[PDB]
C-alpha cells in the first residue's frame, strides 16, 4: 500500500495518473509541468493509489471538491 510519487509545489502534492498531480491546498495539475514526474510511476513495478476517499468512476478525492482517477478529474461536491 503506497501513494504514488510526490509532485508539484515543494513535492506537496501527489500523483493520481501519468499526467495528474493533485494537492490538498494545491488543487489538480492535469498535464502541466508539475505532473511531469508522474510519468515515472509507469516504470515502478509496485502498484500505487493516491487519495483516500473514493468517489466517481474508480476515483479518489484528489483535492478540495475534486475527484480524480489515473486519467481524469471531475468536480464532486462530496470531496
Amino acid at each position: 500500500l503506497r501513494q504514488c510519487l510526490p509532485c508539484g509545489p515543494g513535492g506537496k502534492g501527489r500523483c493520481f495518473g501519468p499526467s495528474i498531480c493533485c494537492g490538498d491546498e494545491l488543487g489538480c495539475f492535469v498535464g502541466t509541468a508539475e505532473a511531469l514526474r508522474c510519468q515515472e510511476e509507469n516504470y515502478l513495478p509496485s502498484p500505487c493509489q493516491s487519495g483516500q476517499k473514493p468517489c466517481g468512476s474508480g476515483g479518489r478525492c484528489a483535492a478540495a471538491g475534486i475527484c480524480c482517477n489515473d486519467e481524469s478529474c471531475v468536480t464532486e461536491p462530496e470531496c
Binding site: 510511476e41 513495478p45 502498484p47 489515473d70
Partner: peptide, 6 residues
Amino acid sequence: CYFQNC
C-alpha cells in the same frame, strides 16, 4: 505503476 495500469 498506477493501479489500473499495472
